[PDB]
Each structure stands twice: as C-alpha cells, then as structure tokens.
Subunit: 333 residues, 2 copies
C-alpha cells in the first residue's frame, strides 16, 4: 500500500534521525539543532504534501521524518534542561501528547469539515502514529521552549553501569511501541471507515494513559510504575490471546483499551527514565537512542500487522512473551 | 508594549498580505501561491522565534503575517473550489476553525505543562488573536486540500453592482472584527492571569458561534442570518452600554458571551457571503479584500482597548453605532 510505504519510510526516517542526530545534538548544541530541524521540516513537509510523483514522495517523506526526529529530540532535550526538576515530569508528560493533540485536532477537523476525501483511496486502514498527521503545527506550537530559552538568555545577559540501564530501557521502550499496535482485534484498523473511531480511541486512550501515569508516578516512583505499566500489559495481552474463552466481545474491549494504557504508559514513562541515568553530557547519544529503538519499533502495524494480517497472533505472542523479558529486567534497574 | 507591537505588525502583516496577495491568487493560480506561502511560513515563523533582537522580532513577524495572509487566502479559494457546493457551507465553517484549533491547543499544552512562563515578562495581556499562536497548526494541517487537489488532478490524468456588495460586506466584515474585542469589561483580561480564561472563553464562544451559524444558516439563508447575526450584536453591545443599570455582573457576562456569538458569526458568515457575489474570475481580488478590511479591523484590541483603556467606551460606542450602519445596509444586498 502507498500509505503503508509512507509510514514505513517515515518510521525509518525517525530511526535515522534519532540515531544519527544525537551526536550533533550534544556537539553543536541543543538549541540550534531545533531551529534548523524545524526550519527544514516546514518546507520539507510542504513539498512532500505538494510534489506528487510516487518516487520522490517517499524521499521527501523520509526526509521529513528525519527532520521531525531531529526536532523532537532537540525539543525533548530543551524541555528536560530548561524546566525545573520539581515539575519537569508534568512538562515531559505534556510534551508527549503534543503529537496526540495534533493528530486528534486533525481528525476533528476532518470530521467537522466532513471532508473524508483523502480516504476512499486507501485499500487498508492507515497506520495510527499521531506524528504522521500530528506534526503540522504541534512542534511549531512547541516552539514556546525556544521563546523561553530566548528570555532566559536575555535575562542572563542583562544580569551580566550506564549501558546496563540503556539496554533494559531500550528494550522496554521498543516493546512498549511495537505492542501498542497489537491491541487491535478489528483487523489492523478495521478499514479506513473505522479509522476515526480508532484514532479517537487511541488518542483518547493516550489521554487517560497520561492521567494515572501523571498523578501516580510522583508518589510511586518512576521505576515502580514502569513495572506496573509493563505488567498491566502483561495481563492485558494474555487474556486477550490465551484465556479469551468467550470474552463476550465486551471484555475484549475493556482489556485492549486497558492494554493501550499500559503500552502507552510504559513508552512515555520509559523515555523519562532514560534522562536520569545518562549525565548532562552525551545525554542525546543515549536518550535519543532509547526512542530510536522505540521509533524503529513503530514498525509493528505498518511492516507486519497490515502486510500479513492473517495469523497476526504470532507477532502478538512473540511481543507479549517479550514483555515477560522486559518485566524480568525492569526489576534489575 | 513588546508583545502588542507584534500584534499590530502581525495585523498590518495580515492586512498588507491580504490586500497585496490577491493579484497572484488570480494570475499565478490558487495552488502555487499556497505552496509558496506555506512553504515560507515554516522558516519565517521559526526565524521570528529564533532571532530575538527587538528589530527583527517584528521584521519577520510582519513577513510571517504577510506569508500567513496568502496561506489563509490561498486555502480559502481552494476550499470553495475543490469541495462540492452542496456542503461547501460546512467546509468553509470548519475551515474557519483554523484559528480556534491552533490557539486552543497552544493554551492546551500550557495548561498541562503548567508552563505559563512566556507570559511572565509581559505587561498587561496579549490581544486575543487566534492566528498569533494558531498559525503553526491548522494550516499545515489544512494541507489536506493539497492532498485532495493531488488526488483530483491525478484522477484527471487517469481519465486522460458587484462593488455595491463589496462595500456592504467589507464594512460588515470590518465591523464584526473590530467589535469582537470590545466585548471585554476587563481589557484583554487585564492581568495575564486571566488570559487563559479569556482565550478559553473566546475559543469556546467561537465553538458555539459556529453551531447556530452551522445548523440554521442553511435553512434560513446566509443573508437572513447575517441580519440576525448583526442585529444580535446591536443589542448585546447596546444594552451593555446604554441600559447597563445594575446588570448585577451576571447579565453582563450573558451578553458579552452573546455578543461574541453575533460578532464572531457576522465575521465568519460575511466571509462566506462575499464568495458567491464575486464570479470565479477575480475571486481573489475582492474576496481577500473583504477580510483584508476584516484583518485590518483586528486592530481594535491593539487599539484603545489595550493601549490606554480609560474611557474606551468611546471606541466601543463608535463601533456599536457603526453597527447600526452595518445592519441598515444589510437589506441593501
Ligand atoms: Fe516522539
Ligand atoms: Fe482568517
């Protein structure tokens, strides 16, 4: 499918950006890279939406994904640096649903506009990745951090071991991404007709996935919830597959929507935990790599869940059994 | 003030672009101008947020307003051409949610992130202009039309008197813009602590302002409601000024929130009405002009409303009395 090829190229662009723009991030700086990546995302995204040739379309889509990866990593670094450690957690949580907000707003626009005309060409349902349609302005709306840095610099001028936690968090971040798309018993999107019902659900499920992850991790600790946010999907994925002995089609939805809680809470939280282990220096080398594994792990739905479709439980059990490995290694932190 | 000088420049950037970028929209086509303007919005908006020197801060804010002028006007021409005329009313209405979506999300992330720090070093409060912070999203999110145009154009390859209504609508669009900001007993919210309560109100009031303008103007006609959406602000602005004999501070809010209905429904509906009068040719010179006066009419908040504030009833009554000229000229259509 053309859309799935776009999504796979976009995920590969995210992987390449997250894996190759860390060294510039910690060498050149954490501010200039954001400006360069955003000022290239703009024209690159416009051209990708403009120049339609089916051969350069994927090239500019990959380039846009690479630049979006760079700007996302830079924005993450600036958020974790400028903000005070007392409330940095809330900023990071709000900085992880920014793409969720962009995608939900795009879908709401399409609904109120009633213009479902970019659909009806897609043979299969599109991948739900947020940043595919949550890039347009969500990151340029997150340019508020550039303003904050500008005012901080102006005020300043006026006044004038590690690898062990990287692999455990890398696998946890990778699994928490590649298992989110597996919580979809209705095909791999249930045709584009049901795409909005799943985009609203996934975005809406991410909203509550930041509530019990937003108000409890401070009291319970980031490691304690990460174990719970990885064992909740360790029960939400067996009864979904193994013990689904007449789940009456209603316990199939209370568990999948519960799976998207833990899967999207063990991916948001795992990104935060990588910051503490890595020092201020070379922070982007490893912290970007953790989501680089995660961004590369967004290949569940596009690469295999939609392409094969039939017998997709074999991927679900492999990833669900891999969650046991992540659970047994989370306590090792 | 430092912030309000951007708003005057942005509006003058919006007014200059709306008036000047009408010749290209009818000579160079309605699609290329969108790609050129939106392509340049990215780098321009980032550069304005990057190079902070108080002289380029407004220099690339004027240019950003000029570029966003073509984007809003260029999308509008494609909105009413690509979409079917049967449901063009909903698309154009939902297309006017460009300001609300981008602005509301900007103060959506800030509420969750609790990062109200860019408003600390700022005196009084910024003007409530949605596209000031709603520019990032809802325009590159409104690239769906470029996607839609690509599919339609690709499908084709597969198969291979007037001035009287301009002044009445121009004045109506201008008045309906410059009177909305006058529905504020506190100037711009006064202290910045009330800015979100006014941004949520104005955006929320614009939400219902598209409901009774969305479900009734089809049955009642665009001209009939425009008279009612201009005679409603002829009472919400008259009893707020003339008969405010102990409105007990609660009937004041039931009228301001009712004034923001009519003033933001006689500004959205007026833009739609001018589309039909002007033919398909020279549909950018005049249709842009109606909101070129309207965008130039967005100076009311940067005007006496916020600059001096004291005795600003004189500016409100002048516009309210001018609204009498607006309603009396509506039947002349
Ligand atoms: Fe991300
Ligand atoms: Fe506009």
């Amino acid at each position: 499918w053309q859309v799935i090829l776009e999504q796979i190229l976009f995920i590969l662009g995210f992987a390449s950006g997250y894996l190759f723009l860390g060294y510039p991030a910690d060498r050149f700086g954490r501010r200039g890279i954001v400006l360069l990546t955003l000022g290239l995302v703009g024209p690159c995204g416009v051209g990708g939406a403009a120049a339609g040739s089916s051969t350069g379309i994927m090239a500019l889509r990959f380039l846009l994904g690479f630049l979006l990866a760079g700007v996302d990593l830079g924005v993450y670094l600036m958020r974790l640096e400028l903000c005070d450690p007392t409330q940095r957690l809330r900023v990071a949580l709000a900085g992880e649903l920014v793409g969720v907000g962009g995608h939900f707003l795009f879908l709401g626009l399409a609904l109120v506009s009633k213009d479902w005309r970019f659909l009806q060409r897609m043979i299969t349902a599109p991948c739900i990745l947020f940043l595919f349609y949550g890039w347009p302005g969500l990151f340029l709306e997150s340019a508020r951090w550039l303003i904050v840095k500008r005012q901080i610099e102006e005020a300043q001028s006026v006044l004038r071991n590690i690898w062990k936690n990287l692999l455990i968090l890398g696998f946890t971040n990778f699994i928490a991404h590649a298992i989110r798309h597996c919580y979809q018993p209705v095909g791999g999107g249930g045709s584009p007709s049901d795409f909005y019902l799943c985009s609203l659900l996934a975005s809406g499920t991410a909203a509550l996935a930041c509530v019990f992850l937003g108000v409890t991790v401070d009291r319970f600790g980031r490691r304690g919830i990460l174990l719970l946010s990885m064992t909740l999907t360790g029960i939400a994925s067996l009864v979904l597959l193994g013990l689904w002995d007449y789940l009456n089609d209603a316990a199939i939805t209370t568990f999948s929507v519960l799976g998207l809680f833990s899967s999207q809470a063990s991916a948001i939280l795992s990104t935060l935990l990588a910051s503490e282990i890595i020092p201020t220096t070379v922070r982007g080398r490893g912290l970007g790599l953790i989501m680089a594994l995660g961004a590369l792990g967004g290949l569940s739905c596009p690469a295999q869940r939609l392409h094969m479709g039939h017998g997709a439980f074999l991927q679900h059990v492999v990833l669900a059994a891999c969650a046991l490995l992540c659970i047994l290694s989370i306590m090792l932190l």
